[PDB]
Symmetry: D2
């Protein structure tokens, strides 16, 4: 007999596992338990802080919720209006010395005219081909060239996506992008070119809310806090080391055994296979591809520069910086960095030189968060990546040579992106049913490895829906039909359903 026995055991207290926990807690039927090797819940949706007081998420984390259930749990966790800041979804593409509003294609009127001609000629070809197309694109690259034409593809989506995915666009599928036809919006693009118009896809109704304190990680700490503490096991005491799928027994690092009837596992599925000592699953999960993410944080002295303004996140297709995305993390909340009265010495100037003075000086401070991808196909010199990022900031005119850097952060996350390679689905439909047949629901960004449902809300709901499938025979919609959940407002499932209402009466 194992030390602990529960009906449903949840491994991992990132958004997915917490989703499973929250749903189990709401249903209040089967016994359950959640474990995490980290004392602090949140996983990749956690937040670090430098010794100088600058917070950094694991790269740009902007919430767009497809589900009311997710909203319910965030509202429960952080119920006060001052728990959040609301911002417009402002993003630009750095291109040829300019900040081009996203979407790129609608804003190429900013480029030299001769280049616009190349862009529009390419999109005309694509439109004419789209007109007689009777096949779907088979690769991410084909998809891009059909949508954008060669010229526009080459300027942004092709080089940008290699910098993101750390694999060539030709090596990825495109089903993950959705069911919409791969055909250019020629009229809209040439209209903006003709009008000399620029326009971002944001405004008063295109917004996101961000936690006032604790970064994105503050949400998941707060969400976790609503769970009965005794049913949680976070820290070294909750690190899973072995999974015995045949005995339905999990062994933790401290030797604790937990027997389960159903397992919801949210650790990366390649790690799950290893913990299972299942050589066949190890082989299969090794066929999956993923990139690592280097997060670089730079804390800068000064009031926010006008050139930066209300920018939130920023895309970098070009070669003059190693990062694919930058986030103005100080715009997300005033508590993402020290108050102006905080005294901090300058560590370096953005041009890499030593500061004139060693002396601690006051703020205000602002803050840049950078992401750099790495894979077997795109190595990263870890030793120079911080300095390369900082030079990248200078090259892109995000920082002046003289800007004073008062804090730096760098951390590598080995499992950063699950790659939608051409081979992903062929592999996953071998892995996930095999685990399913052992009553293991492997779910989450790396639990089930599908980037198109890999955000915080998707993840959360993958855990929720796994539990719902386990308990109430629900369809795992997020898992198996990304286009479905992403194409609608999911309003049916609530933190308080009829069940809880009828039971209280």
């Amino acid at each position: 007999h194992p030390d602990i026995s529960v009906d449903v055991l949840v491994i991992g207290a990132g958004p997915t596992g917490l989703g499973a926990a929250k749903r189990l807690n709401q249903i209040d039927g089967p016994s359950w338990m959640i474990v995490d090797s980290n004392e602090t819940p949140g996983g990749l949706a956690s937040t670090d802080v430098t010794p100088e007081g600058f917070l950094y998420d694991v790269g740009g984390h902007v919430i767009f919720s497809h589900y009311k259930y997710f909203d319910d749990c965030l509202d429960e966790a952080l119920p006060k209006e001052d728990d959040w800041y609301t911002h417009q979804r402002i993003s630009y593409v750095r291109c040829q010395g300019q900040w081009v509003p996203y979407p790129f294609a609608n804003n190429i009127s900013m480029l030299p005219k001769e280049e616009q001609v190349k862009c529009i000629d390419g999109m005309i070809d694509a439109a004419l081909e789209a007109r007689v197309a009777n096949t779907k694109p088979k690769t991410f690259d084909e998809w891009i060239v059909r949508m954008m034409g060669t010229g526009i593809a080459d300027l942004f989506m092709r080089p940008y996506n290699f910098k993101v995915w750390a694999v060539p666009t030709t090596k990825m599928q495109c089903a993950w992008l959705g069911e919409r036809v791969a055909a250019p919006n020629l009229k809209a693009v040439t209209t903006n070119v003709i009008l000399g118009k620029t326009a971002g896809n944001w405004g008063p109704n295109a917004t996101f809310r961000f936690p006032a304190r604790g970064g994105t990680g503050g949400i998941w700490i707060a969400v976790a806090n609503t769970l009965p503490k005794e049913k949680t096991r976070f820290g070294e005491k909750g690190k899973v080391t072995k999974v015995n799928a045949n005995n339905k027994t999990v062994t933790l690092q401290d030797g604790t055994t937990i027997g389960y009837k159903k397992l919801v596992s949210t650790m990366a599925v390649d790690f799950l296979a290893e913990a299972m000592n299942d050589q066949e699953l190890v082989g299969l999960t090794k066929q999956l591809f993923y990139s690592s993410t280097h997060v670089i944080g730079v804390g800068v002295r000064g009031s926010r520069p006008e050139r930066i303004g209300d920018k939130c996140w920023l895309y970098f297709p070009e070669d003059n910086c190693p990062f694919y995305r930058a986030t103005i993390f100080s715009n997300y909340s005033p508590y993402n960095q020290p108050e102006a009265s905080a005294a901090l010495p300058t560590m370096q100037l953005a041009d890499g030189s030593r500061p004139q003075s060693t002396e601690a000086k006051e703020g205000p401070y602002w803050s840049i968060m950078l992401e750099v991808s790495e894979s077997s196909m795109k190595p990263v010199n870890q030793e120079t990546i911080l300095a390369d990022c900082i030079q990248g900031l200078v090259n892109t005119e995000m920082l002046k040579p003289t800007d004073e850097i008062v804090s730096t952060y760098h951390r590598r996350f080995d499992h950063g992106y699950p790659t939608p390679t051409l081979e992903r689905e062929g592999t996953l439909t071998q892995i996930l049913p095999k685990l399913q047949d052992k009553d293991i629901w492997s779910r989450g960004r790396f639990g089930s490895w599908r980037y198109e449902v890999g955000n915080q809300d998707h993840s959360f709901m993958l855990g929720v829906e796994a539990v719902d499938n386990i308990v109430n025979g629900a369809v795992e919609l997020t898992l198996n039909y990304p286009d479905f959940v992403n194409g609608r407002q999911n309003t049916e499932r609530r933190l308080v359903d009829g069940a809880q209402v009828f039971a209280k009466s």
Copy 2:
């Protein structure tokens, strides 16, 4: 203070209401109750029997299930292997003196060569048009022509569908036929023409199962019998006459009042509007279109004729008979008609003449079940329809003039088919949200009026999913996404879910 109070009240014990009841009974959380104006459950899936012992469904009722849940409940209701007979899905189109195997298009080698040429030429036109098509068809009629071409459209699907829907194909939408592209399989069609090949779309795996006894109606009687009787109220005592949406009160014919928190209504939504005395909903619901169904049954003396053979249901595009569909109901179960030793007098010959002898003679017997549609655009003379059907049987060579008719059946069903008119969705999306706002789940073939999810399994699941939405926050997938539920085997929801397993333990 009403006579009865329940959490969830179900109006109607056709498949939809029984689905609601079955799921409610399984969940065994919220209190619930089901009423029906008929002492016998089954609604349009019920079965009549003539004084001579010939059973008739409400027209051809053949089950194809999209749900394991539905399968679970039928297996529970009728668990013996001899509770069912299995048949291949054998259907034919009557056309120019011939029984043409379905699908029609794949079998036009049976038509005159000159006609084949016209058919193939039309389909060539359609194939070439489809190659450069960039719009969806907007009407049922466009859909048909784009799929078949003019020649083939005119032979079968155009005139057939008028005889079914009692409206022109040009007045119906085509979204209900699903997401499949309106394109011809020119190759398949020409290939069978060239080979002089015929091929039906059935075989050892294209089957259905039919109840051994009591016709289709026997399923729903058996299913209802699994419910706690004290929670059922069937007969004049169960007839709803008033629904007060604002007080959440239902009044029955005998004066009994029922209080509900949530209402699952499976009566025709235009009747619900009337029962609610809601003038706005009344106005909106009579904007919905429907046809009535005349079911005509003909019991015939003799062993099954060779010309009939294993035929199950039959399509009649031509105007030499009033019915659109015929079912060889005696093929579905030997118990749909009297045993061979039973003595019955001959009522008339198929050509309308009197029999030579009035004496009762033995069988064996076979049975034809016919459907005639009626609408404001297609009146039916109730006084002559039986005679006209029987003449139609002779005209189509199903009966010889000499065949001995020993039983007739005719019944008009007011609400037969909810019509997928162009205006249906515009109307429904005004009606269902208003009912929803009042905590009324109006669901079913006429509860929610969508033919494409109008079969017994859909209906059953509409009830089930409505309950699941009310209780567990489930998406009503059958209701809102016909294409989704019809394009998969829905396997997640079972008659025994995890919740009941964990509860028993």
Copy 3:
């Protein structure tokens, strides 16, 4: 026995008949004669002069030669370099206050942006349709919209061609336009819009030459002067009044009868039918359509205005002037108007007011030649057309209200344009073969009535080729294959052929 007998009789000494004459003269085989009712050869390629000394062709006459033979004869007629002036083919479309360089489509960057959007959008539509097109346009109008898209068509070619042809574009055929596919050069148009480029289709390559003296009419006088005088009969003495096709006799005004073996007739073919007293032909030729041409000439005092500059001819689609084309005729030759030292009183100012002084003042002078079309679908008020034209000049900002007019000219030419109606070919293919069966080669702008081979060089060559057909069995390429002769350099036929080289030896 007729007064004169010749092998080949040529009626008419416009370019066509002179073509026939020149070729007959060169061949110097069969006997021949040429007659004209006019003492001055040239037909519609003649030139008038006003009492003030301003020359006007019959509307804008610009030579583009497709034939070496035509060049040979022109070189023989006017051999000196100073017999000619060379100019670039400079033309503009007057549109919304702007002189838009021809071709119109390539210069819409001069229009308001919002209009460029509509134009480009329409041409995108046309481009996308053209990609899947599998039929030829049936009408001029369809041809235009397929080439240009709606927006661009509506701006220039649609309203312009109605003002030219005096019939709707929907009533004309489009074969006459040539074999080029009716498809938009979207890329060229969008490219120039993006670049803000304006470009006319002219330069040092694209030139025409114009006679130094006597206007276009000076050419044909000089060509006619190369003919043996005694074989010509020009004036009232040469006016044909009757053709007896059955007797092969022509009767002149003065009573002179001419017998011929073959007749090359270049008068309008409807007049020919009348002269033949052939009622069948009269019937047929009355079914042909043609517009009349009003030529309005305006002599203006002053050096050439800067706004006019090197402009040659000008198109006017818009409704603020009655003319469809204007020619800066003073740009074609300094001898088209009096020298600067010539003194002329001011007749009126352009706004219609009287001049302050009635005295003769010196120049220099420039000159505008306008064309207004007339037909039964488009009446012209002869009494007001001059004044309306002059108002048009002000409206289009060709003339300032203050500009001094020193000469006016108006003349109506009954047969101006042979109209490429939908019906034209059906009618002509009935007329010409009947004339052919009587050894009558009816040829020329109204001899054979085909605009697409209706210029001076085509006309000349129609006569040349008729004679070559008559004598040498040559194919009448210009007559029957406009596309052929217009799509190539016709260099084989020379004014000195091998036959004359070998003969002289």
Copy 4:
């Protein structure tokens, strides 16, 4: 000074040269003469006879005339009705044991149903592709597949045309096939398949006439006979050995020199280049490609077999015989072979055995003429090709094993077909204008190397039009515009033109 001086010298007296000579003779202006290395005129349109009295053309020669002028000269040469036999243009394709009426595609109902399916499927693909095609086919092979689809291409035109051209279809251009769009008549082909219909493209109005005597060669003997003998020089005395283009002097084998002003050379242009000792031209003409033609003739004892019947020529795609075409030459004239009373011993049986006796037996006789192509890409074993051909005749069931062969014939013609390779036009534009600039009109099947204008009428008219260009400035339409002359009836040029009519007065 040369021995002879003429205005125009014509080299070669096949149809091309004779054409030039006829037109020169008719014009009767410039002095001229015509030479040939052969005593008998006719070139590749000549006829041989075996010692046993069997005539053979140089392979199948069937006249289809596009020109009245050619008709006039043939009528002049052979004016009597009994100088000619008229036959319907009856041809078949040998395929899978069947004689399939030409055109093949319209007659594939003769093939097995499974072949029909493959054919129609392939043509459906071609039809769908042609619906969106917007490029011309670049090669002969692309043209075939686009017209026919794969199945049909593979059965006839692909393998047949390799057997003809002795180069792969992928190595040839397709412009020579004319300007008709490369698209299938799917409807017509499937219609005949559906109906089980066969139909040859012949009838009472699809005929050819063949000379009663002397085979095709009889025509050109007769045409040449109409020329003044003293202007001809045929035989060793007329063999050109040297052409000095700079001196305009030609040297014959016997030392005779002929000065000319214009040269019409109809010898193969590569031969001309050698005769000119012009290394540049030799190099260019060596880039041209041509195939050699082996003509095999077989004389057979017996009345014409029923299986043969009225067949005229026959196509052989299949690899069970070396020849690409057979001609039932005995059907063309009864004087192509000996009369029935002629006694001839049997030389061999068709199975290859040498017969019993040397007894000369009587007829009647029939006759087969075969063509086998050869090139550097397709060698022919000259020593065995006769025997291989005869075996082919047995394999294709043209001869029974026991059929008695009484005459054999085999001759290799070095220049047989001028190949429309991809490179042909590029090379000819470097050759023919260079010759032109030296006043050399190189014309004819190998004079100008264009197969699409390479028949007897084309060749004749290339000569005629060359003279007409030389003397009268005519367009060389057949040379430069094969589509033009082949798409019309050329009626204008006659053996008696107006010039001669007028002159005789």
